[model samples]
Target chain A: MERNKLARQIIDTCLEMTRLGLNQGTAGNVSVRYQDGMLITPTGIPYEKLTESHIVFIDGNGKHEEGKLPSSQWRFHMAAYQSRPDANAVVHNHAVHCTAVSILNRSIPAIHFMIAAAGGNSIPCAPYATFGTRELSEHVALALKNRKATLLQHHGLIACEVNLEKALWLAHEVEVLAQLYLTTLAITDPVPVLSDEEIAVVLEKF
Target chain B: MERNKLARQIIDTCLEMTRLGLNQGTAGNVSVRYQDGMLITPTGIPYEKLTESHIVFIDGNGKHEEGKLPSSQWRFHMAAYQSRPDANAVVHNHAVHCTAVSILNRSIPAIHFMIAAAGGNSIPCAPYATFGTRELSEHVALALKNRKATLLQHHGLIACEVNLEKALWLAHEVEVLAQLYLTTLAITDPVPVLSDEEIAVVLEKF
Candidate 1:
């Protein structure tokens, strides 16, 4: 609950993604909202080796007062918090299905009611842009508007929620939905997808 | 490791599956060969609540001395050991991609050279049968005869290896490959599959 625990959860969640087969090495990033800034994973270090200090912090202006390098993709996480006071944790992974679908420049259509958890009938994909660029960060921020998850074209996925656990859970759910969607494509073309109203009905049961 | 410690590891590994997003709740099973029998997870128990005694020990002859109950699907883990002599641990998970692929009655192909990890150019799918049925167990045995992992049609997957760690790792890899295969389908049907020679080159590196 405190900033200290938040730092550990950030690293643990990042490592948990590797164990979950969602991400490998340093291919993904995890962050938690803290104080006036966020505790973000550092760039390109094996997650297992990340110590507390390696979990860098950046102020609202997007500058780390001082620490090891933070994740290269921190801009969107910064932009996410600035735009949406509701998002407290963010998970970004180059999960297989999400990346595969993104490679095709495909927006994951709602083939399962679980899509509703992502906040819409689809997990939208922002157009392709080079990583760590302002263009990519802006595209990601735009795609995540009103959605809990979104895909980066030819890149990966981003899922955020009210907390670290929920953010990680939602990101994993997005990958599962992407996998189900892809498998349906294997069985049949133009898979009859779930409708917005259909998803609404499923969500109401909660 | 001592059999006493193994009992704990068995339950720990089962819980790991959930934490790793390989399975959820009470939906999967884990087992390790022990003392002419096997130590397995208990049926119908929340993994988080499992303790030492909850890890059931079943003899090679199918006798459980004491426990709440052995995993209902222990037969496959037992059969896997008797059939593969090389296997010391087995992980059975209804993982998302593997289950999704199985639901489509398809085997995972050699999309990535990592397919060699499954001990062949592809991971086979066992024909469908009811859960906890000997027929399903037999089907799984036949499918995994020369492989480290097998998908059960309309069911889930079984991954066995020399240890719980590798078995769980392979099982997770199978899920990843399934995700990759499914994603490939989305990009294009009749997706390109790698050849044995290609996979052979990959194995040589090891």
Candidate 2:
């Protein structure tokens, strides 16, 4: 029942993201910790069309259940699990604001207090690389150092959490922060940023 | 059947807005053209809690037949249908990026190709005015003089179309454009925006 429930949740979340405007059609992927490796959504299928049987299960040894191909970006999903031992799920999206920030090659500074939710004052932007490549995966891992979310250069955003719900919420929050930061940068000579000292105090409260 | 269907759609669109990340609870309103005036969502009810009984049927003279209080922003909803006969539905929301742009008191210029989809090169921002007042309604109408969408200074956004679905879709698209515009504005020395001449070419096709 737990596995079935998680599977249902996986598809439910996919549809939710699509419905909620966080990700476009088949433009993002979701995966969660399972038995050996993880359970991930399949490739190229619209979330609305996705069914329970479509969720592909991949083992730590690179074995995929149901003979299905996991999302093309499975490499990063696996890397996230291995790199961040605490991360139980991964959600990646080419969200409008996150992608906009990514296009600038700039990190989202502490423009607002909520920036601390990403485990840092600023969400870093990973250098641009071809999608679905080992190179891109490596870049993402580096960018995510000491952070739970990072913007992909010319691509999108990556947010990992201890579960699917948290990952989804984090992804949305990151977009909201990106929206605020981008707006603050619209007309000002110097974008006001909350200092590391201030963010540090906020971090302690966490 | 028609009246009940419109009533259902009014509530459905409210829930859709919440599900679409276009709004939070009680922060936005939706309405569709009915026989006399329009069917609008009731004020202060969470979308999930809304029902057919919660929809308020209002007449051209501002008489709400059902005696249920319509959205506090109902003045603008009425104003939009009165002004734009082509717009059979109205959607208003305090979406993130739109609100951010509104706070800057700036119209979203032609940064992306889809900017023309709003029937112009930019989505204008009306000057700030108190919510739920005739002054706010008047400013909104002025800003939306020839546009299907506009920002309410320090407030939110309004999107209208021939029906509820199209109106909701347009609202979501405006949010997407706002997100893109805000992000493009975040870079150093300022990012170069597209020219009106170029956008006019885009407008010709739309």
Candidate 3:
């Protein structure tokens, strides 16, 4: 795919996420795989005015091949691509509910069907890493060993899927589940969770 | 007014609010007055792709006039239009901090100049009502007397103004105030609010 087309998709997806309340402000990024390289959203770019040609593409070695700049979290994205043969897209966002859970120093347990969609038995929490550092990227790779999604403590969330659509879908599910969990706390009780049998059924469907 | 134009305005305003973190997901509705009817968002329409054609209009009697369907809370919006002579635009949403305060049954005090910008000493909570009902609409109307904003008690908030811009601005201010108020709860008592003289000064500016 042309770098410009991928850039447009990345921009569109980021804006859509912001408009849908999945991410607020410039708190999220998106990337996709193309035949020649991977394209990702650039750091600190306002999503509202993003264009396709602005997307940054890098080869497997993390060298920028096209576009203005790569996302600050490029190292983690590269690690995912290297480890997961089937993954073609990755998304990271600082959605409110998910980040709320992340701030608690605990992983968001699988309490709903949405967890299965997030590609985890429970969304694990990676130890806090300084933003835009290689250490943060390395922790993400380690945390997602067998999971499709992982929550970054005091930061945000990460999700990778077979393609962009699934990646977005998983991100959406994680956020809703986070909200549902938090609402339970507000209502004076933990929201009831699906039983082991129910989880098994949902897993079978996924 | 043409139905398409009204829809476009509603969608645009909704997306803007979502991007600003004033509203999330399908949690808010925007309405504008039209000569023949009122233009409003449809139930469950995500802000991202909502277009002008997606807006539904209803006459004073609540009969759907344009678009596929009206919002589930059409009655609440109609009630505001009917009760408030000064209002030409209405917004309702479950903003994070505002909803947090409402869930705790707390009222907003005149802690900052923005309170006057919302047209009162404080934003009051309307007693709770079941979603999509006439009772809820009436409760909100009564609560909003002489005030520009009110909380829907565990549900969300309602804000109206002379125009869309003012309505949107007031809604955003309420969210900010809500967050500030909540932050106060975390510390060992926030600094005392400004005195009555200070508030009078703010009132003069508004």
- Two-way DockQ contest, 1 vs 2, winner: 2
State candidate 2's DockQ: 0.15
In candidate 3, what are the lDDT values of residues A19-67, reduced to their tens digit? 6677875778888887655888877668876776667878877789543
Off-target runs (Cα >4 Å) in candidate 3 are: A1-206, B1-5, B195-201
Question: Candidate 3 - CAPRI tier?
Answer: incorrect
Q: What DockQ do you compute for every candidate structure?
A: 0.13, 0.15, 0.04
Rank all candidate structures by their DockQ, best first, as comma-separated numbers.
Answer: 2, 1, 3
Better of 1 and 3 by DockQ: 1
**TM-score for each candidate, following the candidate numbering:** 0.58, 0.57, 0.58
Q: Return whichever of 1 and 3 wins on TM-score.
A: 3
Ranking of candidates on TM-score, top first: 3, 1, 2
lDDT of 1 by residue, B1-206 (tens): 88779988787788788777788413688899898998888876667788887788899898986536888788888889888989999999878878778767778888888889988888998876545668877988888789989988755789999998899889888988998888777677788988878888888875
lDDT of 2 by residue, B1-206 (tens): 48888888877888778777788535988888887798888877778888888888889999986557888889898888877878899999999989999999898876555567678888999898888889887887776669999999888999989888778877887887787766676554354455677567556645
Off by over 4 Å in 1: B1-94, B97-206
